[PDB]
Symmetry: C4
Subunit: 452 residues, 4 copies
């Protein structure tokens, strides 16, 4: 534990980034249309408040060496986009790289940190995603990467404008060890893709290689979760591990795959940044993003990432030879416990645990192991495909259907025993007894345990 | 071999640390009540003399930048705690981190070494445990970690007050190579836990990964012993490998597990720091901590860590799939040999060795291989559960029961053939013959060999 | 993506280097005789335009510390060789090492970069191959190797003469990450040899060890391709991965082995540098080097290295126990796709794929997966052994037989639907259908897919 | 290739070091008695000319900070020992460490290089073995270790006295890459021990881990040879890989084990430093050290370490589970080839090769593969146990029995077809035919091939 370095990131950030679905094809209009949609779907008031403009936004630098926004894409400048966002209670995120160029080859901020931070503050930006392309050999040890990322941390501080600082160096040089003192979150892997298990030659480090020398990209969901597993102990209030944008509503993930993915990102206290096109978002994916019960886990006050209790490889493997099952467990601020039974195997299987496994650091005879716990299904009462379809088609309003965190914070809701934040009680677990469930292929049993 | 850098640590340190059982809930009263108990149990006069106050003791820094003790927890200042300790023939240990913050998020000493060392000397501290949380990217190579730890070594020297300097950087950047010239001991792994074999996702480096890039914590007893195995050659008089505080009397280790753990920590010349709550210590655990014969191994003059002679995996595995058997052997200053037959398997098994294996660096026809050796059981004559229970319940005194090392040092005792320091002769081993014993699951046969 | 650092290497370089076949036995006469032959074979006008003089060319340094060409080997100086080359529309490459000495022990350029770059510019050199022998400990981290290679990059820039800068540090210290900002290409492995699969003790890093600490040499074709596989994502316009000179026409590779080797080097956008003796080049090898269709892949505008889609080990292993099969796929600027079915096994086998695998980053229902694609065999219409033998024996001219890229660029040819650049249409692949072929041992099916 | 940095080490050094058999118990008398014995046994005139005094020779430093020889062990100073050695045509070696202390805890030379080099030159020393104990964190990257070893290289040069500079840093930080420009030889592993295969917990890096982070010691013969295998390419005239002192005549190696060990150290161009006590040396070991034919391999002019052609694990394993077979081959300056068939398995086995395997870098149809080669057994005509026993017992003189390299160099002897340097012709190997032999357990077939 340490205080937040800048007072921000007291819980992981939530929002949306245009990259997965728009790439370099960005504009003021795109950003504001999306923001309007995120507001109208009631997703903004669930906490998805950072509208993060990614790469390809600039056209070069002026005679003073200042970044210039592309005037075709942003005819009114960036500050004007910020103003529209702020006027609808959004926060505005922008992008650069700690290199000569950005990943798409636009002007990068390496050695230009003071001017570039100043540009972002002049344009009323609230968040910076800060990449690792073209870093001119300034990597390879913790100390060199730390000083490069600190250069922009300090420059942003110098502006006097609070900026949520999001590192994007893919875990390179053990970022989880040094991120907290200079940043609010850090990517800890190469880019995720809409694949649950698929090994990819562009992502050469497997799930056990958390200290990876070629982060790459097109890393699968499970590859990234596995990399993140040991890293929870180095995250907490003010500084989070970042498992990359959610692929919910992107590509061809099954409903089970999307539930597993959203639930596990929540449970490890990853940022929850929508990667989908919200104006081209299907019903099942929308109700995943809108599951208040799961977001409440992610937004637990004094948040602690959950711990992987066990992992076993199974003979039920998919088309790519992949198949493993995992149990995760983690404390919650009100005294409850989050439990995940994760079936990464190719077939539906029964999955089981006990209080001894769930309360993994509790001694025999402790009050946690001696007590009875009520099991709540965190996926109960999800917005059904019909209501979701109605809301997306603008025939129904999200107001009164989705939980409004702006009106009543997750903390306050949990205190008042709000049904929408706990899911449904489905039973109880006593000492000596076992919790048994059937878990779909590439799916999850996601529970909140409460003292009876 | 090299001289002790500061004249201290001529044998490994012994004492107690409040962390395992009290965490941040510390006070003067806790410290003095515990110290009184350690004195009264006769554990102080066995050599357990460092009372080490861990994290969470400070409240901030004053207008001069000096550390301030929490005045609620320490109403009289730290120097007053030291005075009480010294008046009962104890030594006083304190804690900081070579980082911006301590592990629990209190003020750290990085870049503040001169003031902080001065604070400790002003408060009459005799020992510093010096952590590795929040190190601001100052790790990753031997040279950078060495200079950070040297900064505090030098600062402590500058005060003129002798301070036993205990490194806590978890082996990071090959500490065993550089610790000796600037420190008296160094942690060589992530934190131990009360588990004999259990792999843990928070401790991602297995037993063979001595050069680990994510030390983590909740590492099992065997995981840490295995990591330590190759490191014995880089320890000795003045500078020791530190396998973390003893879990004897903590959690739910079996009696065999606690004997194996205490015996192996002694045998590799780890510090022997009680991790138990001494005012909530069970009988079997108390008599483990009080085994004079085993402490005498640890406190051998001109101490040499023992060497692992062999390791084999066995089919008898526990609930976590773990099972291995090991033989260790090491020289003792008086010419005797310590031998350990370690059964990490899940079932009781017969275990065997010969003089050739025991005296692993002796040539055929050498006088060690040609001679007959008397076998002594170092666990013979342990304080029985009844006497231990009586002493702990304050119905019997430890005086005249436990060995008094203050009255007569371990060195002197061994010279005078003191029965309490050798255990019981159980037989002899001749050339060509084999030593056979039955060793309990997760247990040990721990012997001292003497020339007949 | 980033712009070319110096405006060169817009596509990978093509040419010839004397090393494989002449070693230190070089002279003006050798160079000009070879160049005449490369011109007359029509290989120059296919794009093989860099005549690269390798090691052993100098005799020492003069009283000013300037490099001196060996006056026995180069009686007229180097600039005179350049002039002859330029007068036949060739470009001239030379060699040094970023060390005290070159690999063969001649004067190296480390700490002498300004003078040596000046020497090369004074002698009208167009290309520098820059080795990594005898680097005086200046390696081990990205930052140190980057600064050493940057020293010569800057020195060459200072001369004002455009020089194509080719790194030869064998991938050491993750060159693919830092090469682009200071160089046009970088060797990414130890030296290739004329072996398709053979493990060699002089090349201790296997195919999966892309981050290798002892690059070595005598690395097999497949060893180097495997190392290169994850690296494609860090290559592109202006800066390429270099898989070493082609062994086509060197040693005893089969015709299938040479086709696989040439096709895969083309497909990953490696430089295509002839390693053969062109005055001692056999017919089958000549027609491999002259396959316009395959060169057009390598010289695709806005070039993207292909991606390895899958790799499986097979039971059909060669004399060295090696056997694997691979599928590669990559985009082409005009919208076509290159597909490679690679049979590294010891026997001829059927090989298969689908549109879903070929278009690996396309979603179900996308227009690429829903469309029908015409399959073109890129090895169709290769110059037959008879015509090749006739041309090599100076009985037939290459004019009107080999494609003339000087007359009409690869880009322009592809636009005009030139038959010589596409191979032969052999069928079509529809959704849901499978592409089936038989692939010879150590051979390849190499296709261009075009929308029907 | 590069020139020798200082003109020395044109072939690997030969001599003797007192450590293995005398440890810290050294004196002038020991050194001169041993030297007299090495002279009288005719071993000096075979090339064993460096008498290397190891650790524990000093008593401290004087008021000027100069090293002081222990006046009890060296009553006349070191220069006087040098004079006696030089007067019997020996060269004198001494020892320090690139650390605060030597390995045995005597004064080390780190930061004292100028004075210490001066001390050695003042005392007429010809050779320095320069250790790596207590290096004060100055390791971990190539650059830091290189600069530490360069500091003493430069200091020795500054004295103006030629000193053969022998590195002893156990291969740490890839010494084979940077040793040549500053030193004549470099240890490339932790200390050898008199075990042919035995894995040891004190030597945690196995045979494949050439880039080892804990070199350790008690490494077996095969462990060290395996580590050395890829390193041959970075050795040659002026700078050699050092596989540690020979264990021939030390401990309990079989005669086959000692022949394999001596032959392989010769063949890879390791230094050949006698580790035995020459006044307590058995007959079989003496005739191993005196095999002129094998020394001639090691002392080949323009020496090239041999290459491991293949390695296979066998089911015939020893008490430690070890068993592998290897073939090595290497060029010799006169055009001959050295071939080793190495049987590391537990039983006698037939071993076979062909000209294609022997001449591993030769193309089919080359003159080496098309020619017939005479096979010479390099172990033929070894001094029999009787003659050896007679010489050692001072009943026979070595003069006229052992080859005298002082009288006639190895180069000259080979030119004159001297029978003593070639062994005995036992047959011939033709194209298409196989060389078949039976090789004893842990033994070797060691051949020189000559064109018929
Ligand atoms: C995944 O594949 C499904 C078919 O299984 C496909 O329908 C999705 O693409 C989306 O299809 C929608 C048709 O109802 C269409 O309206 C939408 O534009 C389209 N999305 C895109 C980006 O083309 C695939 N998943 C996704 C989210 O693309
Ligand atoms: C391990 O579990 C045992 C039961 O097998 C449990 O009794 C121990 O906890 C201790 O129990 C004592 C009851 O006699 C009690 O007096 C003591 O307070 C309690 N310890 C703690 C810290 O709660 C468990 N081991 C330990 C040492 O905690
Ligand atoms: C590979 O081995 C073949 C035999 O299978 C051999 O012929 C090649 O060497 C070349 O042989 C030619 C005979 O027609 C000869 O003219 C040529 O000089 C010779 N090459 C060399 C360098 O000696 C072998 N391959 C190669 C390309 O060397
Ligand atoms: C290895 O073991 C053999 C027995 O197999 C033993 O004899 C050797 O020790 C040497 O024995 C000699 C007896 O003839 C004796 O003269 C000699 O001093 C002794 N060596 C030492 C150092 O004690 C063993 N090998 C060696 C070379 O020690
Ligand atoms: C935002 O609202 C403020 C009123 O609070 C107004 O002054 C400003 O013009 C608005 N900007 C935009 C772009 O809507
Ligand atoms: C700048 O840094 C200081 C911490 O040193 C902090 O108090 C302040 O909030 C920071 N300001 C901004 C704008 O982040
Ligand atoms: C909602 O639709 C998704 C597919 O988009 C499907 O997987 C899931 O089963 C549906 N849930 C319901 C309400 O049946
Ligand atoms: C300080 O260092 C010197 C060694 O240089 C030593 O003599 C002295 O004992 C040290 N003092 C303390 C208080 O540790
Ligand atoms: C002492 O009690 C422990 C349990 O606390 C038990 O394991 C052990 O067997 C007992 N020893 C005796 C004296 O029987
Ligand atoms: C030198 O560098 C600059 C880029 O800073 C570039 O504009 C110019 O083309 C370079 N000149 C040469 C000769 O490469
Ligand atoms: C051309 O010759 C090569 C051998 O050099 C052979 O492998 C191949 O089959 C031949 N191709 C033709 C035209 O048959
Ligand atoms: C010192 O170094 C130079 C090489 O710079 C060399 O010429 C000379 O021989 C060296 N002298 C000694 C004594 O090694
Ligand atoms: C010489 O003696 C050794 C044992 O010291 C033995 O291994 C070898 O067989 C003997 N050689 C002869 C001449 O038989
Ligand atoms: Na507007
Ligand atoms: Na004398």
């Amino acid at each position: 534990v340490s205080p937040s370095y800048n007072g921000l990131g007291l819980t992981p950030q939530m929002g949306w980034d245009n990259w997965n679905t728009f790439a370099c094809d960005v504009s003021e209009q795109l950003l504001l249309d999306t923001a309007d949609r995120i507001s109208d779907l009631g997703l903004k008031d669930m906490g998805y408040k950072y509208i993060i403009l990614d790469d390809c936004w600039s056209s070069g630098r002026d005679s003073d060496g200042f970044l210039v926004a592309d005037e075709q894409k942003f005819p009114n400048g960036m500050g004007h986009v910020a103003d529209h966002l702020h006027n609808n209670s959004f926060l505005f995120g922008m992008y650069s790289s700690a290199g000569e160029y950005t990943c798409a080859g636009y002007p990068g901020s390496l050695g230009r940190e003071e001017e570039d931070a100043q540009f972002f503050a002049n344009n009323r930006v609230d968040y910076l995603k800060y990449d690792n392309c073209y870093n001119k050999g300034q990597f390879g040890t913790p100390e060199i990467s730390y000083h490069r990322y600190k250069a922009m941390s300090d420059a942003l501080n110098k502006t006097g404008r609070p900026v949520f600082y999001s590192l994007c160096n893919w875990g390179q040089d053990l970022t989880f060890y040094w991120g907290s003192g200079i940043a609010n979150s850090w990517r800890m892997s190469g880019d995720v893709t809409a694949e649950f298990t698929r090994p990819d030659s562009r992502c050469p480090c497997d799930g056990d290689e958390y200290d990876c020398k070629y982060a790459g990209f097109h890393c699968s969901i499970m590859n990234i979760l596995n990399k993140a597993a040991p890293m929870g102990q180095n995250a907490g209030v003010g500084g989070w591990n970042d498992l990359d944008n959610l692929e919910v509503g992107v590509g061809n993930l099954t409903d089970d795959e999307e539930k597993a993915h959203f639930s596990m990102w929540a449970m490890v206290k990853s940022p929850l940044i929508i990667g989908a096109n919200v104006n081209n978002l299907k019903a099942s994916s929308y109700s995943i993003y809108s599951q208040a019960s799961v977001i409440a886990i992610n937004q637990d006050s004094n948040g602690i990432p959950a711990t992987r209790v066990w992992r076993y490889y199974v003979s039920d493997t998919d088309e790519y030879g992949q198949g493993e099952i995992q149990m995760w467990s983690g404390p919650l601020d009100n005294g409850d416990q989050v439990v995940a039974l994760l079936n990464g195997g190719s077939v539906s299987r029964p999955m089981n645990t006990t209080l001894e496994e769930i309360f993994f650091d509790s001694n025999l005879g402790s009050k946690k192991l001696t007590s009875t716990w009520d099991i709540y299904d965190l996926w109960a009462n999800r917005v059904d495909n019909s209501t979701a379809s109605a809301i997306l088609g603008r025939n129904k309003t999200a107001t009164g259907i989705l939980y409004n965190a702006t009106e009543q914070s997750y903390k306050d809701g949990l205190s008042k025993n709000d049904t929408r934040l706990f899911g449904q009680k489905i039973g109880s677990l006593s000492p000596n007894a076992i919790l048994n469930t059937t878990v779909p292929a590439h799916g999850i049993a996601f529970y909140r345990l409460r003292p009876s």
